[PDB]
Design a protein around this nucleic acid. Structure first.
Ligand SMILES: FC(F)(F)c1nc(S)c2nc[nH]c2n1
Length: 266
DNA sequence: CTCTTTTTTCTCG
DNA sequence: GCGAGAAACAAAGA
């Protein structure tokens, strides 16, 4: 998932597990608990969930005053709320058992991660990863964005995916954003002009906020409607909305890349 | 049978 | 520092 899907999960979890005391925690794949499963089980068992936050694509469980559980779903992670007698499914790895239900984490590819960190270490955790601003008008400053693009020789799509210019874009929404902003994915950022950068900035905010409103593109968060609004991603060979052309797919920095050549010339 | 396809971080030259 | 390619992993499709 990307930021809109993680935000949709965050909102549903916030509605349902805040206030719940953790009765037990079980793992069939403890290796995804990067800080140590036995330590996490000891610290969090018997604690009450106080809230669920998000930063970029990271989910942040607020569990007691002094701990946060930082969860990343990577490529295929999925959460579901199940009854206590729910049968185990093949790719379930972790479960947080409450008195009247359980939160189960599944991940076919086993990429997703859990990290237990103390409350006063959350901001340093994200500083160390150099995560960029949240994609909102209030947080995403166009002036700094423009300066960073000017000083770099990177291609725009890889640079946006690095999470350092702005947080939360993945392969789907970066393709949608560059189509909407009429920018080639291999455009070198120091060749972007101010009016293009302005449109890119606004387009990032607008696409991600619309995606959040529509519940993401498609367990929790599986009821999104943003997939019906995608213009280029996964649409290889189909006609662009700025009509005439067919959507092409190339490889850029090892990622499948969907774009409309006429609309996105360098 | 092989090869390719679908977030983050590391290795290598 | 850089970028390309690979690594972590599983399943499905060509
Ligand atoms: F593909 C890419 F290599 F450009 C890339 N994509 C994503 S989603 C990403 N997240 C952190 N770093 C990242 N690099």
């Amino acid at each position: 998932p990307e930021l809109p899907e993680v935000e949709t999960v965050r909102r549903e979890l916030e509605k349902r597990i805040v206030g719940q005391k953790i009765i037990s925690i079980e793992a069939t794949y403890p290796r995804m608990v990067l800080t140590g499963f036995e330590q996490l089980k000891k610290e969090l068992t018997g604690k009450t969930i106080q809230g669920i936050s998000r930063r970029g694509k990271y989910l942040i469980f607020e569990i007691g005053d002094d701990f946060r559980l930082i969860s990343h779903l990577r490529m295929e992670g999925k959460y579901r709320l199940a009854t206590l007698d729910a049968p185990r499914e093949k790719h379930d790895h972790l479960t947080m058992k409450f008195a009247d239900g359980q939160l189960i984490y599944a991940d076919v590819r086993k990429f997703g991660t859990w990290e237990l960190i103390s409350t006063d270490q959350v901001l340093p955790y994200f500083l160390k990863k150099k995560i960029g601003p949240e994609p909102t008008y209030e947080d995403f400053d166009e002036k700094l964005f423009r300066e960073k693009l000017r000083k770099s020789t990177k291609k725009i799509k890889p640079y946006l995916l690095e999470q350092t210019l702005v947080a939360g874009l993945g392969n789907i929404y970066v393709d949608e954003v560059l189509w909407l902003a009429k920018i080639h994915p291999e455009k070198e950022t120091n060749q972007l002009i101010e009016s293009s950068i302005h449109l890119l900035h606004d387009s990032i905010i607008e696409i991600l906020q619309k995606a959040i409103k529509l519940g993401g593109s498609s367990a929790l968060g599986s009821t999104g409607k943003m997939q019906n609004e995608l213009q280029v991603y996964g649409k290889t060979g189909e006609k662009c909305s700025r009509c005439g052309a067919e959507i092409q797919k190339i490889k850029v920095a090892g990622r499948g890349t969907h774009f409309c050549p006429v609309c996105q010339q360098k």
